[PDB]
Amino acid sequence: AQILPIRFQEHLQLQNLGINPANIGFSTLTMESDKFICIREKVGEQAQVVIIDMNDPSNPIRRPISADSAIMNPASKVIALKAGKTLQIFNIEMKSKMKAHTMTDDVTFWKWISLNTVALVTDNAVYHWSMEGESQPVKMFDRHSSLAGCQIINYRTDAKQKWLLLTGISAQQNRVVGAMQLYSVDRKVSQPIEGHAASFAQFKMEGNAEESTLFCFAVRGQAGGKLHIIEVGTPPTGNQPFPKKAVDVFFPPEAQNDFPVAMQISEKHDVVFLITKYGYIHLYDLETGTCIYMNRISGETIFVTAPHEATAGIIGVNRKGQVLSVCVEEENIIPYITNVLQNPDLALRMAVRNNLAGAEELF
Ligand SMILES: O=C1N=C(NS(=O)(=O)c2cccc3ccccc23)S/C1=C\c1ccccc1Oc1ccccc1
Fold this sequence. Notes:
It is classed as endocytosis. The protein is mainly β.
């Protein structure tokens, strides 16, 4: 068989839209959802910000805007801008300031965690800040000492905002070591975890009426590459617990310095997408951890990812400016699982879930 369980797509080449490759990187380019990319560029002496609307990519909007960091809202024409310790949320459509706040501590990382809330990470704490109303940032938890001095690379929550996860990395010798802090809002407890990339997911087990809240993380530490899928906290009333899964994360012999950097989980397909530093993608079944597919999909590091809503896939930007995505190929995944993976248990479970499109309708 020459069929794949995935479809790879190239959506854009940012260098073809007038972006300097020097600005295609984590400190200057943000992609908080699949709807926009925002780039900060200094051209001559002038600070400029560029917004690429992914529905209208050939018409980037570029303006002289001074900001140390810029993150578009996941859905609205709303942008958060930082300069020093002062933060602003700005309504672009209405050319009007929504909210502003001056922090005491420097915000070293920030990210939209929902359609209306931005998370703020300082050296010692994490806050949530609504874009609505008058409310100021609210401290969610204090940072755990295991993340001290890390470079923060991600912050994310489960859908219900009851489980909060901060992820950093640090250099030790010639290694890149991942440190995570998982915080339970209900329990007011943190747990340190050695991890490089992670995501949450909602999964409805066979036999259960209510979805389980799953936490998936991957790491490459002293025991090698490992992926874990675990239910966090107490199951919903009436549910059976999700049995913890643990599987190997493979790296080939020529990739001893590769490690996980990003994860997204398909809401529709119950598949984990894992991206590595060297530009590999792995697919894993969320229920079992079974590895479905691995391949190198990018010749450059992919430094930012988001869910790709249209395909329930993953979209990312690599360092040369290729905007790429991977999703399940809904017609070919079960054939691939049947004849290449030769995993009929998975083939059957996937068909029973019945979340793969088949046979086009008339409207
Ligand atoms: O020059 C301008 N270009 C704008 N484009 S945008 O699409 O709304 C727009 C807004 C925010 C971020 C953007 C990033 C990339 C591309 C366009 C952006 S808003 C604007 C000036 C402005 C408008 C309202 C209130 C204040 C404004 O600036 C001032 C700053 C300091 C002091 C006085 C004014």
